[PDB]
Amino acid sequence: SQFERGYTSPYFVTDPERMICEYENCKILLVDKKISTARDIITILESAIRGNYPLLIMAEEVEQEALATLVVNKLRGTLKVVAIKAPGFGERRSSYLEDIAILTGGTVVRDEMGVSLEQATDAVLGTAAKITITKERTTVVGDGSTAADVAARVKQIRNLQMQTDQDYEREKLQERIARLS
CATH class of the missing domain: 3.50.7.10 (GroEL)
Incomplete structure (x- = not known):
């Protein structure tokens, strides 16, 4: 992050x-x-x-x-x-x-x-x-205390990625996933 x-x-x-x-x-x-x-x-x-x-x-x-x-x-x-x-x-x-x-x-x-x-x-x-x-x-x-919550947020951001087909926004979303990974 x-x-x-x-x-x-x-x-x-x-x-x-x-x-x-x-x-x-x-x-x-x-x-x-x-x-x-x-x-x-x-x-x-x-x-x-x-x-x-x-x-x-x-x-x-x-x-x-x-x-x-x-x-x-x-x-x-x-x-x-x-x-x-x-x-x-x-x-x-x-x-x-x-x-x-x-x-x-x-x-x-x-x-x-x-x-x-x-x-x-x-x-x-x-x-x-x-x-x-x-x-x-x-x-x-x-500090690793929120692993399940972070996993779920990453999946949620990927579902938002599926709900947009503007590439720029798909990309900003992928960057959020990277920052949580």
Whole structure:
């Protein structure tokens, strides 16, 4: 699972010489809307701190206010956190976030559909064996806990492949299968 979104602040790096952020046994917050302030996700941040978990946040955007709070807490050593923009745009962005939720055992937090952001708990968090974030790219390695779910999602993407005969879209779908494989 690799795609072309990088860290939203260079202060999130863990290796300043290489300019990369690397964490193991990392919690994953997937949000299909924007995060405007840290108040929006304070319950989630508290949970990550209570469990001493690194946290990767993927959102439509993490706005300036929230980003500044995350950076100050990271610099102080309070929070091991990194934020990226969710990959893609529109419906594709939503599809990719759901792929990553399935890989990591997380739950996409949506606008209106399901639990809202301010009332989301740590139950929505996915978990990854390893994440590596560079200036331009994100890699998520799953921890193998969702093998059946990922298998089913791959078959589902193949059925979507059968429901389109536009080659370009068949190809984007095959790339999603590769990223889940």
